[PDB]
């Protein structure tokens, strides 16, 4: 049996494109154009596996 | 009551952003209160009277239809002047998050300049030039940017509007920028011409007046 | 498309670090509900008799 | 720092709505910058500099005391002109999630028109009609309307205000709803009175100059 | 959609709350849109058109520079005039969570006022003196206050701008506290001088009228 998580939380802060001129970092940074992609795939927040 | 009151604004954008109309106001076509809700924000859905016809209303009220004679007896035109100011640099870029010579953006009073870390004020300005044309390509806040003759540090900037621009002295990276006020920008609109001078003599004084009459040539 | 078939018993391990000597007895067994008599589980890294 | 940005706003409603104040700004009764905390928001709590005093005074500003003369070359009175459009409709009132013929509220620009299912866009607009009458009953960015001509499924329409009003085609039950441009809105408030020629040649000129004095009468 | 409208705002702070700009707006130098963003908020961030730019615009619009000539038949100086008000006051000071002569802060009108429980309208007035006097100190919308000749619990007040002010009676702590407007406030800005009479015979008229020329002293 897993115990898993009990709740947790995740959250993102990216800046875009040049602004951030810095790659996404764990769920702390995230980096794109927005207006180029719509939503995200999260690897983008902290993933752990539960 | 704060709840209620933070319940408050949804959807920000002006049009949605209410405004208490005036009471009793019919500047407006002697029709309605300043601010009234309008066709614009009807179709948006928004009700209430608000910030967006505000500002139009007593826009369309200072405004002066082409031609009018503005008549004064100074005698400057009444077309407004943008403010022109430097922005002085100093410094070398420094980012310790990165190796030296590392491309990096700065917001130079918010325009992002792309500078490597390494680059003294003056090679920052070299940067600065590229985002003050984007500045100008983008049309935004600033009208035209100019070298600073006597120093590659500082820059002559112009800005688009008429209005006054005051900015807060910073320091990223190692480079200090801060906002030096060349030029006051003056009161105006539109693009107005001198007719003339009038000399009036007033009806009992002895001594003949002067008038300047402007008229909008935009 | 997918056999995710039966269904799976739940193992939990607690250490119980011995002091004081004494110690003949543990409470409660895990903290929550009760201990599942019928596979006896102790060990003195020694795995404890059935 | 988006935090204790997004922070912010709380009440909305304008008043309560924060403004940075020009810095020296006297224009106000040669007093306070606009938008300067007024007696109508610290009753109200709000003890900050505001969107709502910053909207007024300017007005204030721009209103011009009655009798006042606007001279002009040209002869175009001051006062404000409202914007009319034109409402094209067209196609049937479809409503697939209820049998034909059954009554719904359609937003035109956002007026709510009662129709039924199945309604081409003239009896569409024969509904349209009965919000624009609410529209100018209420009196909501609508002065008035008209029935196009020649066109049940158009609308002649005229706006309370003065300002400009531009909307986006849409679509809604079979519905198309767009707006025609008819007439421009000019700038203006109040109502104003032309008092006559003035021909006048000024100082040095050969040719006398004429002028158009325009008294407010509203 | 109230979601992402909802989402909105972030950092109130008007700089910050965007303005959908005039479409085709050249009337800030003949360059930009209304309200359209400024290097001030873009050192703040905020790369949209604005509300804080929207206001100095047409207030830069509305401001004619000093020594311009305003014309009119009438002579009403252009110069703006405040409001000024009764504050009408009744009852005792009544602190039911406090005994009697309970020092507690009363807002008048949103301003505190320093009084003790028992204290019946004028002890409360005379409360009140010394908050007007902060209001004054602070010059925080009201001009002036003075104490109601033939009441003490009256007091004539006076607000530092030109707008309009009206306030809702309300009873605190068993303290009514009302406004009672004495003297409305007049559109204008600045200091103006009237030059003089200036009779004019417009050009086929056989009556001459009066023009009076008010220049703008600040």
Redesign the interface.
């Given at each position: 049996?897993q115990?898993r998580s009990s709740y947790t939380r995740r959250q993102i802060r990216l800046l875009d494109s040049?602004?951030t001129?810095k790659t996404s970092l764990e769920g702390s940074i995230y980096v794109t154009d927005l207006s180029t992609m719509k939503s995200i795939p999260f690897s983008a927040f902290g993933l752990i596996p539960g | 009551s704060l709840l209620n009151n933070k319940a408050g604004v949804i959807s920000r954008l002006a049009d949605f952003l209410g405004f208490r109309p005036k009471t009793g106001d019919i500047d407006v076509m002697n029709r309605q209160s300043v601010g009234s809700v309008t066709i614009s924000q009807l179709a948006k859905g928004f009700y209430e009277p608000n910030i967006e016809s505000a500002i139009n209303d007593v826009h369309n009220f200072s405004i002066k239809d082409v031609g009018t004679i503005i008549t004064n007896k100074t005698g400057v035109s009444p077309e407004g002047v943008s403010q022109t100011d430097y922005w002085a640099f100093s410094g070398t870029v420094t980012d310790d998050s990165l190796p030296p010579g590392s491309p990096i953006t700065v917001l130079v009073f918010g325009l992002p300049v792309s500078a490597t870390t390494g680059m003294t004020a003056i090679e920052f300005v070299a940067k600065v030039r590229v985002a003050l044309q984007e500045a100008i390509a983008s049309f935004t806040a600033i009208n035209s940017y100019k070298d600073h003759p006597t120093d590659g540090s500082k820059l002559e900037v112009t800005y688009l509007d008429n209005q006054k621009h005051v900015l807060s002295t910073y320091s990223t990276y190692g480079i200090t920028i801060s906002q030096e006020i060349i030029s006051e920008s003056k009161p105006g609109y539109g693009t107005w011409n001198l007719l003339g001078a009038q000399t009036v003599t007033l009806d009992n004084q002895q001594t003949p007046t002067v008038f300047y009459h402007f008229e909008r040539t935009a | 498309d997918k056999i995710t078939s039966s269904d799976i018993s739940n193992v939990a391990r607690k250490e119980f670090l011995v002091e004081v000597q004494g110690q003949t007895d543990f409470l409660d067994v895990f903290r929550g509900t009760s201990y599942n008599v019928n596979n006896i589980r102790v060990k003195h890294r020694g795995n404890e008799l059935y």
């Open positions: 049996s115990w040049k602004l001129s | - | -």
